Design a protein around this ligand. Structure first.
Ligand SMILES: Nc1ncnc2c1ncn2[C@@H]1O[C@H](COP(=O)(O)OP(=O)(O)OP(=O)(O)O)[C@@H](O)[C@H]1O
Ligand SMILES: Nc1ncnc2c1ncn2[C@@H]1O[C@H](COP(=O)(O)OP(=O)(O)OP(=O)(O)O)[C@@H](O)[C@H]1O
Ligand SMILES: [Fe+3]
Ligand SMILES: [Fe+3]
Lengths: 680, 674
């Protein structure tokens, strides 16, 4: 049984199913492949089209998954989609009523069209299975837990009919115990509140990082007007008829000022995040207290997008309601896509399940074989210097010991939002200074948020209070207290309230990364590193070798360790050898607005990315003329000759567009098809 | 005692409060001026910025109203705004959470900023009065009815708290009797369903025009699942949690396919419209049957946007529930703006009301005095020929009897969506072929669309069944049956179901238009004319003289009668003398997307109008370069010199953009102050 799991919307690479399709319309597109009950491959489309949390159809993800499994498309026994057919088709139909130019293509026809055109694959109708959304979440969360039975809680924005579902899991069977309707959504409540902080979809993790700086007392009584806890683990969220936001009218009535772009977080803002986080924690703990007692179960699996609230998970762990708690590395909708594969297998016959608890999220495409990596890094020679140490991990541990900040790229990319030693940025965890230092290097502005530590399994309890239940820490799912006598030692990874979102790495979960952190501890007496995702502010986690080198070159990292090669940026990198390529969403525009006295107004030039929420940037007339000639093969230096040569000013302008990923800049050609390293 | 009524959003001419602000966020912006209880001026901002049902702040409308009243901003005693302050501000606050770059400016500050920067008018806080939305509607509908007591029904999409309100009115006092919550909205229901026919906001009256072509039986049982009538005048609409549309999920599940743009209206689409119309009729008549007998009122005023459903109104008329029914010419939110003025007067003193029932909607700016109109028509000389007949009404009646289709522009423009003899297109009402052609060739719209007749008050009962209650027909508020023995005679203006949305014109409601219809009847035996609004498919009703001439020249009208001047298009009109001007929302774009092998794609050029729902059109590289040099003063002919002269191809390309109103093209100068 080889089963593909799908989630996301149905847009092509260069256009959306309707123009400017909202970023919340079936997001985090991904493809998963299960074989004989095991997750053999999984990657989010965002890693391949470079659009964070993309809604586009995960065609590249499917292609990559088939290649990792050594399968033709025609080898796939079934395809599961993470929503029931009537629901996704009703939402598409609604979009089609709003955009009457859009042809009436529903999900089944669109899935078949994408696979046929993108992969030559004629998908027979009987192989496509649509799945209840919280059922897909529950299979993913529970089947990877290693448990024989468990209480399973799914909380997200919404499935087809519910915002929350409670199951009993035993063997391979799910039994639904309860649900909560869409308007009680805790994901919706949290996203609603996130907007008041000048943030939006996908920034919830920043709001959760801000909450420890706030005093939850200030707005506790205000949030108390928006929910009521009830008997039998029930609750109500009190809506309004004013706007489609649960939170904004009451906070407006009380004088709250929603944060503007570029404005710093006031004390009101920090307090607001603290009270929002406390509110959700109290509601979820109210749910779980009731269902722990009523079901009598001692084990919990927690899935859905809300299960990426690691602060909440830490409190669930500390609550003593359960003996064990498991959280999947991709508990958002990409994991529901994975669960849809299992549900399709169950519906189309018999369900094989994983043999063991999941410990590694390293499931995407790799960087490539040793020989094509060396050759590709040679293509980059005019920008980088490369060394080949005999023991790269030893060298790297030493570099980190000296205080250098490292890019670290090895093997298959992480499924889910956390970097865990395959597409990571690692540094010494002790100096408090590394917080503002590394934010500046990657140009992120989350100095209020600490970094996450990775510690060896052997040393974990010497630094972190894992007490309460036995939770899984291979994926940073849980916030835990840092032992008080260790907080000063771990200055870069300890929050203001003494907690940390810890990864515990073991020889089983990540051999090479474990060896790195252990060796650093042997060298320093502290076997803890900070571990942040390898991406700047304008991209998801890097995927390919070119992605990795690009990100290294456009950030202020000291050195890059990639498949045992040490990469450093040349004193003066030659941008001119890079070949510019449009992304499918890249648009280059000359604009005239209306001027005074009804004249044609100012003539401006701009580059932007054509998707809901995509960035945009002004460009000079000269760079406009240069970029208009991009042909996908001619180098930047040769293109620049048409406008007088690649001056320092033009190169600087191009480099700033490169940092924001408006276009692709890389040496001519590519690394080639990823080698069969014989590890399957 | 002089009071301004305001409605709409707060956006400037060239940008919106937030980018691409939705077309439904406080639309149909307008301004009204009340003096001593009388409505002395009123105009919708759409007529002035040329954006249909615009949401932009009605600055031009306020300026035009003050000019018509002969008043200065300082003379205004109070300003009413047609929604409560907390509600509009909470909506703005919500928009600001979605657009973190927008500064936190709420309605009080925005209204004062617009009036200060736009009119030099420093409005004190104590003169600005915010009004309950359905109260504003009710004042407008009731105070203009001529009645001293009535039941008043307001039905729209929503006010701040309700989708429907029932009032008792006595003297100048309103007392609420009932209201209906927002989820029960009949305006929302109708708009939800309108989207399944490939239409959008503002297209509801086209759905209503489609419905008589359909069989209401086909989808009657489907619609029955979406509402329940309950005892004592109550009802329920049955919502869903799938999408924010009440209608589309159930019809999707039963296999209905929403109409695509540019595709025909099938019999299923017709049947859908028929069942939707029947549904709203059944619910409203249910409400009214209860509240008529419960309140004891023999007279009804009906307002809110749903009261522009002429078919519904005609059924209310025929129901026997009331002896008299009144409907205001602007029953949508522009009329709520007017009622907000009365409500503001009532809160700051006692309330003066109109002395009589409103008979004329001729309330906007006029076209100009005779001298400036003749002078402006001379500026258009390279494009038109002008005659000055001794008796233009006499001449126009003869032209109509000879088969000509006429533009008709006189005096002050109509408040509200209907043309009533001040900004009208008229033709012989007798030949069915006139409907076919004026739909296909003149208005350029769908073949199913009906045309409305105007008839003299003295002949009305010779042609139409007005029986039932006494309704007011001066504003085309009611669909009525055409008498069976007259249906063949009135071929262009009798709908497929034998009805007509009639205007009854009298010497008192419109002396000049009444004279035209009467004379046509004396020449032909039939005192009835086809009367459709004077606008092409890309614009609201024309306002100014330049608007009128532009529309005449870009639609296939035979002759224009404007303030007693007979205008015809020249054999070969010289477009080169016209001076192009950008509209405040006009944008010009050269664009590349990605191309094969991740190249930059080939260049394309577009003109577009930068507002939500604004059109766009491809342009040639040559015209892109030409339009980039527009300065607002240089003629098209001189501009074209930079691209080698106004060729025939360029002039034709420019003509098509003019027709779609992407830019303003008119002779140098303007008509001056009116
Ligand atoms: N750290 C967090 N704390 C609270 N809520 C979060 C957090 N992270 C994500 N969420 C919420 O989870 C929800 C998204 O979860 P999920 O990925 O399972 O998709 P979804 O709600 O089912 O969307 P769709 O309707 O398109 O399927 C959002 O509402 C989001 O605000
Ligand atoms: N012929 C019609 N039949 C039924 N409903 C109509 C018709 N014409 C307009 N409507 C409805 O009237 C409603 C609008 O009425 P109105 O102008 O009074 O504004 P509103 O609902 O108060 O606007 P807002 O969105 O700002 O609250 C819309 O829902 C519209 O669908
Ligand atoms: Fe989900
Ligand atoms: Fe209204």
């Amino acid at each position: 049984m080889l089963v593909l799991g799908l989630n996301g919307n149905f847009s092509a690479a260069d256009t959306d199913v309707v123009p400017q399709l909202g970023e919340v319309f079936f997001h985090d597109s991904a493809a998963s492949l299960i074989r004989d009950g095991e997750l053999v491959a999984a990657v989010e489309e965002e890693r391949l089209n470079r659009i964070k949390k993309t809604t586009k159809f995960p065609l590249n993800a499917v292609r990559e998954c088939l290649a990792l499994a050594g399968a033709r498309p025609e080898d796939v026994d079934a395809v599961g989609y993470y929503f029931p057919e009537n629901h996704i088709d009703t939402v598409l139909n609604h979009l089609y009523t709003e955009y009457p130019r859009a042809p009436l293509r529903y999900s089944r026809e669109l899935i078949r069209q994408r696979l046929k055109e993108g992969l030559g694959w004629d998908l027979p109708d009987e192989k496509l299975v649509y799945v209840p959304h919280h059922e897909a979440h529950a299979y993913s969360s529970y089947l990877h837990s290693g448990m024989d039975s468990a209480l399973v809680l799914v909380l997200d924005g919404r499935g087809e009919l519910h915002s929350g579902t409670v199951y009993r899991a035993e063997g391979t069977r799910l039994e639904k115990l309860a649900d909560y309707p869409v308007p009680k959504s805790l994901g919706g409540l949290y996203l609603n509140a996130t907007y008041l902080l000048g943030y939006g979809f996908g920034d919830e993790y920043k709001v959760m990082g801000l909450a420890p700086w706030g005093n939850p007392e200030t707005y506790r009584d205000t949030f108390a007007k928006l929910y009521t806890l009830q008997d039998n683990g029930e609750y109500e969220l009190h809506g309004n008829i004013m706007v489609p936001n649960l939170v904004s009218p009451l906070f407006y009535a009380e004088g709250f000022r929603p944060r503007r772009k570029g404005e710093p977080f006031t004390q009101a803002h920090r307090d607001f995040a603290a009270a929002l986080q406390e509110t959700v924690e109290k509601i979820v703990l109210h749910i779980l207290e009731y269902w722990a007692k009523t079901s009598g179960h001692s084990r919990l699996c927690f899935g859905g997008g809300v299960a990426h609230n690691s602060s909440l998970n830490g409190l669930i762990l500390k609550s003593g309601l359960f003996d064990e708690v498991f959280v999947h590395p991709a508990s958002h909708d990409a994991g529901a896509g994975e669960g849809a594969a299992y549900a399709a297998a169950a519906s189309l016959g018999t369900l094989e399940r994983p043999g063991k608890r999941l410990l590694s999220a390293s499931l995407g495409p790799a960087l490539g074989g040793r020989e094509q990596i060396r050759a590709r890094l040679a293509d980059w020679a005019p920008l980088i210097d490369v060394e080949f140490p005999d023991d790269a991990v030893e060298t790297a541990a030493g570099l980190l010991a000296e205080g250098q900040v490292l890019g670290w790229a090895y093997g298959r990319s992480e499924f889910g939002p956390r970097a865990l030693g395959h597409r990571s940025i690692v540094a010494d965890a002790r100096p408090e200074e590394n917080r503002t230092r590394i934010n500046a290097m990657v140009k992120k502005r989350e100095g209020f948020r600490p970094f996450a530590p990775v510690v060896t399994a052997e040393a974990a309890r010497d630094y972190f209070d894992l007490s309460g239940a036995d939770g899984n820490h291979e994926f940073m799912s849980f916030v835990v207290p840092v032992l008080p006598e260790r907080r000063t030692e771990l200055g870069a990874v300890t929050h203001v309230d003494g907690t940390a979102r810890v990864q515990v790495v073991s020889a089983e979960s990540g051999e090479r990364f474990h060896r790195l952190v252990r060796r650093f501890g042997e060298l320093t007496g502290t076997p803890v590193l900070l571990n942040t995702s390898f991406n700047n502010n304008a991209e998801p986690i890097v995927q390919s070798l070119d992605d990795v080198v690009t990100s290294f070159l456009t950030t202020d990292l000291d050195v890059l360790v990639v498949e045992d090669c040490l990469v450093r940026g040349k004193a003066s990198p030659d941008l001119g050898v890079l070949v510019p390529r449009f992304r499918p969403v890249t648009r280059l525009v000359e604009r005239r607005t209306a001027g005074p006295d009804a004249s044609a107004g100012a003539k401006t030039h701009e580059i932007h990315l054509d998707y809901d929420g995509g960035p945009s940037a002004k460009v000079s007339p000269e760079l406009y003329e240069l970029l208009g000639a991009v042909d996908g093969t001619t180098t930047l230096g040769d293109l620049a000759k048409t406008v007088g040569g690649l001056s320092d000013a033009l190169a600087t302008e191009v480099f700033a567009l490169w940092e924001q990923r408006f276009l692709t800049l890389a040496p001519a050609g590519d690394i080639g098809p990823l080698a069969d390293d014989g590890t399957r």
